[PDB]
Coordinates of C-alpha atoms in Angstrom, one line a residue:
Chain A
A206 CA 80.4 110.8 94.0
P207 CA 82.1 112.5 97.4
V208 CA 85.2 112.8 98.8
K209 CA 86.1 110.4 101.0
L210 CA 88.7 110.0 103.8
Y211 CA 91.5 107.3 104.0
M212 CA 93.9 107.0 106.6
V213 CA 97.2 106.1 105.4
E214 CA 101.1 105.7 105.0
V215 CA 103.4 106.9 102.5
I216 CA 105.1 103.3 101.3
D217 CA 106.5 104.4 97.0
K218 CA 107.0 107.4 94.8
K219 CA 108.3 107.3 91.7
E220 CA 108.4 108.7 88.3
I221 CA 107.3 106.8 85.5
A222 CA 107.9 107.5 81.7
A223 CA 105.3 105.5 80.0
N224 CA 105.5 105.8 76.1
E225 CA 107.5 110.5 73.3
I226 CA 104.2 110.3 75.5
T227 CA 103.1 110.3 79.1
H228 CA 104.8 111.3 82.2
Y229 CA 103.4 110.2 85.6
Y230 CA 104.0 110.9 89.2
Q231 CA 102.8 107.8 91.2
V232 CA 102.7 107.0 94.7
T233 CA 101.9 104.2 96.4
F234 CA 100.1 104.8 100.1
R235 CA 98.8 101.7 101.7
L236 CA 95.7 102.1 104.0
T237 CA 96.6 102.6 107.7
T238 CA 93.4 100.7 108.9
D239 CA 93.1 96.9 109.2
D240 CA 91.7 96.3 105.8
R241 CA 94.8 95.1 103.5
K242 CA 94.7 97.7 100.4
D243 CA 97.4 99.8 99.0
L244 CA 96.0 102.6 96.6
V245 CA 98.8 103.0 93.5
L246 CA 97.6 106.7 92.7
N247 CA 98.9 109.1 89.7
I248 CA 98.9 112.4 91.8
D249 CA 100.3 116.1 90.5
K250 CA 104.3 116.7 90.0
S251 CA 103.8 119.6 93.1
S252 CA 101.8 117.6 95.5
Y253 CA 104.3 114.9 94.5
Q254 CA 107.5 116.5 95.7
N255 CA 106.3 117.7 99.1
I256 CA 105.8 114.0 100.0
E257 CA 108.4 111.9 101.4
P258 CA 108.0 107.7 101.9
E259 CA 106.9 106.7 105.6
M260 CA 104.8 110.2 105.8
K261 CA 101.6 108.8 107.8
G262 CA 98.8 111.4 107.2
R263 CA 94.6 111.8 105.5
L264 CA 94.2 111.0 102.0
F265 CA 91.4 112.3 100.2
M266 CA 90.1 111.0 97.6
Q267 CA 87.4 111.5 95.2
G268 CA 86.2 108.4 94.4
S269 CA 89.5 106.7 93.0
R270 CA 90.9 110.4 92.0
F271 CA 93.7 111.9 93.8
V272 CA 92.4 115.3 95.7
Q273 CA 94.4 115.9 98.5
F274 CA 97.7 114.7 101.0
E275 CA 97.7 116.1 104.7
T276 CA 101.0 114.9 106.9
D277 CA 100.8 114.9 110.5
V278 CA 103.9 117.3 110.7
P279 CA 105.6 117.1 114.0
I280 CA 105.0 119.7 116.5
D281 CA 102.6 120.2 119.6
Chain B
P61 CA 96.6 72.3 80.9
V62 CA 96.1 72.9 84.6
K63 CA 98.6 71.7 87.4
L64 CA 98.5 71.4 91.1
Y65 CA 100.1 72.7 94.2
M66 CA 100.4 72.0 97.4
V67 CA 100.5 75.7 98.6
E68 CA 100.4 77.3 101.8
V69 CA 99.1 81.2 102.3
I70 CA 101.5 83.6 103.1
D71 CA 100.5 87.4 102.2
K72 CA 96.7 88.8 100.8
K73 CA 96.6 92.6 99.8
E74 CA 94.0 94.5 97.8
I75 CA 95.8 97.1 95.3
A76 CA 93.7 99.6 93.5
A77 CA 95.6 101.3 91.0
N78 CA 95.0 104.4 88.2
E79 CA 95.5 103.3 85.4
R80 CA 96.5 105.5 81.8
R81 CA 95.2 109.2 82.8
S82 CA 91.8 110.5 81.3
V83 CA 86.3 112.5 85.3
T84 CA 86.3 112.5 88.7
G85 CA 88.6 109.2 88.8
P86 CA 91.1 107.9 85.5
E87 CA 90.6 104.4 85.0
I88 CA 91.3 102.3 87.6
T89 CA 92.3 98.3 88.3
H90 CA 91.4 96.6 91.3
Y91 CA 93.9 93.8 92.1
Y92 CA 93.4 91.0 94.6
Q93 CA 96.6 89.6 94.8
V94 CA 97.5 86.7 97.7
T95 CA 100.7 84.9 97.7
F96 CA 100.9 81.6 97.8
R97 CA 104.0 79.3 98.9
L98 CA 105.0 75.6 97.8
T99 CA 105.3 73.6 100.6
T100 CA 106.8 70.7 98.4
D101 CA 110.6 70.6 98.7
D102 CA 111.8 73.5 96.2
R103 CA 111.4 76.9 97.4
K104 CA 108.6 78.7 95.4
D105 CA 106.3 81.9 95.2
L106 CA 102.9 82.2 93.5
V107 CA 101.9 85.9 93.6
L108 CA 99.1 85.9 91.6
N109 CA 96.1 88.5 90.7
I110 CA 92.7 86.3 91.2
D111 CA 88.5 87.1 91.9
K112 CA 87.2 89.0 94.6
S113 CA 85.2 86.4 95.4
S114 CA 88.2 83.7 95.9
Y115 CA 90.0 86.2 97.5
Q116 CA 87.2 86.4 100.3
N117 CA 87.4 83.3 101.4
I118 CA 91.0 83.1 101.6
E119 CA 93.0 83.4 104.5
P120 CA 96.6 83.4 105.8
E121 CA 97.8 80.4 107.3
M122 CA 95.1 78.1 105.3
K123 CA 97.0 75.2 103.4
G124 CA 95.7 73.0 100.7
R125 CA 95.3 72.8 97.1
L126 CA 96.3 75.7 94.0
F127 CA 95.3 74.9 90.8
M128 CA 96.7 77.0 88.1
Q129 CA 96.4 77.2 84.4
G130 CA 99.5 78.1 82.9
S131 CA 100.7 81.5 85.3
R132 CA 96.9 82.4 86.0
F133 CA 95.0 81.2 88.9
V134 CA 91.8 78.4 89.0
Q135 CA 90.7 77.5 92.3
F136 CA 92.2 77.0 95.7
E137 CA 90.4 74.4 98.2
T138 CA 92.0 74.8 101.5
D139 CA 92.5 71.0 103.3
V140 CA 90.2 72.1 106.2
Chain C
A237 CA 129.6 102.3 88.0
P238 CA 132.0 100.5 89.8
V239 CA 131.9 96.3 90.8
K240 CA 133.1 95.9 94.4
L241 CA 133.3 92.4 95.7
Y242 CA 131.8 91.3 99.3
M243 CA 132.8 88.2 101.5
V244 CA 129.5 86.3 101.3
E245 CA 127.5 83.4 102.6
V246 CA 124.4 82.0 100.9
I247 CA 121.4 81.8 103.3
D248 CA 118.6 81.9 101.3
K249 CA 117.0 81.1 97.8
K250 CA 114.1 81.3 96.8
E251 CA 111.4 81.6 93.2
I252 CA 109.2 84.1 93.1
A253 CA 106.1 84.2 90.4
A254 CA 104.3 87.3 89.9
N255 CA 101.3 87.8 88.7
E256 CA 102.3 91.0 87.0
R257 CA 99.3 94.2 86.8
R258 CA 98.4 95.8 83.8
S259 CA 101.5 97.6 82.1
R260 CA 102.0 101.1 80.8
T261 CA 100.2 91.4 74.6
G262 CA 97.7 91.3 77.9
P263 CA 98.5 89.8 81.6
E264 CA 102.1 89.2 81.3
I265 CA 103.8 87.4 84.5
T266 CA 107.2 87.8 85.5
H267 CA 109.9 85.1 87.4
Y268 CA 112.3 86.1 89.7
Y269 CA 115.4 84.3 91.5
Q270 CA 116.2 85.6 94.3
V271 CA 119.3 84.4 96.8
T272 CA 119.9 86.3 100.6
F273 CA 123.2 86.5 100.9
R274 CA 125.0 87.5 104.1
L275 CA 128.2 89.3 104.8
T276 CA 130.5 86.7 106.2
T277 CA 132.7 90.1 107.6
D278 CA 130.7 91.8 110.5
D279 CA 129.0 94.7 108.8
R280 CA 126.1 92.9 109.8
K281 CA 124.2 93.0 106.0
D282 CA 122.1 90.9 103.7
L283 CA 122.2 91.2 100.1
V284 CA 118.6 90.1 98.4
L285 CA 119.1 90.4 95.0
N286 CA 117.3 89.2 92.1
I287 CA 119.2 87.3 89.7
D288 CA 119.0 85.2 86.3
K289 CA 118.0 81.8 86.2
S290 CA 121.1 80.2 85.6
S291 CA 123.1 81.0 87.8
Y292 CA 119.8 80.6 90.6
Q293 CA 120.9 77.6 89.1
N294 CA 124.2 77.0 90.0
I295 CA 124.0 78.7 94.0
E296 CA 122.8 76.6 96.9
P297 CA 122.6 77.7 100.8
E298 CA 125.6 77.6 102.7
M299 CA 127.8 77.9 99.9
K300 CA 130.8 80.3 101.0
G301 CA 132.4 83.2 98.3
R302 CA 133.0 86.0 96.4
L303 CA 130.1 88.3 96.0
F304 CA 131.0 90.4 92.8
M305 CA 128.1 93.5 92.6
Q306 CA 128.0 96.5 90.3
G307 CA 125.8 99.2 92.6
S308 CA 123.2 97.0 93.4
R309 CA 122.9 94.5 90.7
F310 CA 124.2 91.1 91.0
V311 CA 127.1 90.5 88.8
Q312 CA 128.3 87.2 90.0
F313 CA 128.8 84.7 92.8
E314 CA 132.2 82.8 93.2
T315 CA 132.1 80.1 95.4
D316 CA 135.5 79.7 97.4
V317 CA 137.5 77.2 95.7
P318 CA 137.9 73.9 97.6
Chain D
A94 CA 96.1 102.6 121.0
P95 CA 98.4 105.5 121.3
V96 CA 102.6 105.0 122.1
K97 CA 102.5 102.1 124.4
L98 CA 105.9 101.2 126.4
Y99 CA 107.9 97.8 127.0
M100 CA 111.4 96.3 129.0
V101 CA 112.9 95.2 126.2
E102 CA 116.7 94.0 125.4
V103 CA 118.5 94.5 122.3
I104 CA 118.9 90.5 120.9
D105 CA 120.0 91.6 117.4
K106 CA 120.4 94.3 114.7
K107 CA 121.7 93.8 110.5
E108 CA 121.0 95.9 107.4
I109 CA 119.0 94.8 104.4
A110 CA 119.6 96.0 101.3
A111 CA 117.1 94.0 99.1
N112 CA 116.1 94.5 95.2
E113 CA 112.8 95.7 94.6
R114 CA 111.0 93.3 92.2
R115 CA 109.2 95.8 89.6
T116 CA 113.9 104.3 86.6
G117 CA 117.3 102.4 87.4
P118 CA 117.1 99.6 89.6
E119 CA 115.4 99.7 93.2
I120 CA 117.0 99.0 96.3
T121 CA 115.1 99.0 99.6
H122 CA 117.6 99.5 102.2
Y123 CA 116.2 98.1 105.9
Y124 CA 117.2 98.6 109.7
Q125 CA 115.9 95.4 111.4
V126 CA 116.8 95.4 114.9
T127 CA 115.7 91.7 117.1
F128 CA 114.2 92.7 120.8
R129 CA 113.3 90.5 123.5
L130 CA 110.4 91.5 126.0
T131 CA 112.6 90.8 129.2
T132 CA 109.7 91.5 131.3
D133 CA 107.5 88.2 130.7
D134 CA 105.8 86.4 128.0
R135 CA 106.7 85.4 123.8
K136 CA 108.9 85.2 121.0
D137 CA 111.5 87.7 119.8
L138 CA 110.4 91.3 118.0
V139 CA 111.7 91.9 115.1
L140 CA 111.5 95.2 113.8
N141 CA 112.8 97.7 110.9
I142 CA 113.0 101.3 112.1
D143 CA 114.6 104.5 110.6
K144 CA 118.2 104.7 109.8
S145 CA 118.9 107.2 112.6
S146 CA 118.2 105.1 115.9
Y147 CA 119.3 102.1 114.2
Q148 CA 122.9 103.3 114.0
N149 CA 122.5 103.8 117.5
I150 CA 121.4 100.3 118.8
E151 CA 123.6 97.8 119.5
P152 CA 123.4 94.3 120.8
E153 CA 123.1 93.5 124.6
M154 CA 121.6 97.5 125.2
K155 CA 119.0 96.9 127.5
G156 CA 116.0 99.9 127.7
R157 CA 112.2 100.8 127.2
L158 CA 110.6 100.4 123.8
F159 CA 108.1 102.8 122.8
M160 CA 105.8 101.5 119.9
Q161 CA 102.3 102.3 118.2
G162 CA 100.1 99.4 116.8
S163 CA 102.8 97.5 116.1
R164 CA 105.9 99.8 114.5
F165 CA 108.9 101.3 115.8
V166 CA 109.0 104.7 117.7
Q167 CA 111.7 105.3 119.7
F168 CA 113.8 103.1 122.1
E169 CA 115.7 104.6 125.5
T170 CA 118.0 102.6 127.0
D171 CA 119.1 103.5 130.2
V172 CA 122.6 105.3 131.1
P173 CA 125.9 104.0 130.4

């Protein structure tokens, strides 16, 4: 599959320590377009910390896998 | 056994959620939930994950009969 | 984890039966008994807590009383004596 | 479309603390304020907005509401 772009807004963010066994960094990205859709994705620790609720940016997915999130920072 | 409910469709959303880890995709489950609200006296809301098919023929504001078997969605016939 | 008081008024009440998504058994579904409390003071604040079934059954809209909460968790609602 | 502008008056304001369904509990704070398009038109606009703006908005305040699609942006009230 190819890397697809999704215009979205950050609604959730939380760590899940599902059982010792696994730890998870999940964030809920809700589609910003008309098509009502939320993407509850498993993402990396690092990317997780730089993401904050209410951020609106571009979500890059490789099918069902999180590739990157680029917020629309305040400037210009 | 299957009960019937006079309900109205309020919300409706799709939810693609990654599950347990392990390829370029980590095992996901696509959900199609719709919020049904009772028309009767009591205030009850049924937030059910239903089939893609039904989901597409369901729109907010629709009123009708909801058929649940236990706490699982069976059918929704809009009275229109 | 102290327990504060909130002079309130019962505005809403609704049961929420929700199908849960695959967990961390089968397809479990959770019940939620939520009631909306509005501060009778002037703080312009509404509490929309999920409380146990038994309490929900004894709380009707338009009642006024003391609301006890431990942090953000509902503890009890005492309806102003007659 | 880009940020739109509407002449408006602040009808109400209220804070909503609500328990999320779904480690710990889970609280979501909403800072919703009700506006009224005074120029022409319909019913009132209920919108949750950032904690920052909320605190500066008081009922009866008259000003301009800047939105985007249907999401708050800023509320510029005329001088006092």
